[PDB]
Design a protein around this ligand. Structure first.
Ligand SMILES: [Cl-]
Ligand SMILES: [Cl-]
Ligand SMILES: [Cl-]
Ligand SMILES: [Cl-]
Ligand SMILES: [Cl-]
Ligand SMILES: [Cl-]
Ligand SMILES: [Cl-]
Ligand SMILES: [Cl-]
Ligand SMILES: [Cl-]
Ligand code: NA
Ligand SMILES: [Re]
Ligand SMILES: [Re]
Ligand SMILES: [Re]
Ligand SMILES: [Re]
Ligand SMILES: [Re]
Ligand SMILES: [Re]
Ligand SMILES: [Re]
Ligand SMILES: [Re]
Ligand SMILES: [Re]
Ligand SMILES: [Re]
Length: 129
């Protein structure tokens, strides 16, 4: 599924991300924009052989199992395929684990390089939430 901007903002809020670990909703919407262009089915293979999955491009080296990332962990205890669903529950629940683990949203390189420090409220401006 490709979410609209305000549609994703609302879904993320319903799933408890607004101000989760102190990160306002706009941070999460911005991260999703630049990670996946709001496409739940986004995948991208990394040079180390791991793969990023879903609307927040969660990586198989640590967070999910795809059976093809040698030496990796599955800290969210889910198949990576679960991160591709039109329903964002699995991605959100895993993202909550990730952002709680010490480095906050810096875990998402695109957030750090493109959202951090910017007017992220713009991503939710005008939306019914
Ligand atoms: Cl949009
Ligand atoms: Cl947009
Ligand atoms: Cl915001
Ligand atoms: Cl594996
Ligand atoms: Cl393969
Ligand atoms: Cl594990
Ligand atoms: Cl699995
Ligand atoms: Cl933080
Ligand atoms: Cl930007
Ligand atoms: Na894994
Ligand atoms: Re939902
Ligand atoms: Re719903
Ligand atoms: Re909010
Ligand atoms: Re990415
Ligand atoms: Re990534
Ligand atoms: Re690896
Ligand atoms: Re703003
Ligand atoms: Re909402
Ligand atoms: Re509201
Ligand atoms: Re809501």
């Amino acid at each position: 599924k490709v979410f609209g901007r305000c549609e994703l903002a609302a879904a993320m809020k319903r799933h408890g991300l607004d101000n989760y670990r102190g990160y306002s909703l706009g941070n999460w919407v911005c991260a999703a924009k630049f990670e996946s262009n709001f496409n739940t089915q986004a995948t991208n293979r990394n040079t180390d052989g791991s793969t990023d999955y879903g609307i927040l491009q969660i990586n198989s080296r640590w967070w999910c199992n795809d059976g093809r990332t040698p030496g990796s962990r599955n800290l969210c205890n889910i198949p990576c395929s679960a991160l591709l669903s039109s329903d964002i529950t699995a991605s959100v629940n895993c993202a909550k684990k990730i952002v709680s683990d010490g480095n906050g949203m810096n875990a998402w390189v695109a957030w750090r390089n493109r959202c951090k420090g910017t007017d992220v409220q713009a991503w939710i401006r005008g939306c019914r939430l």
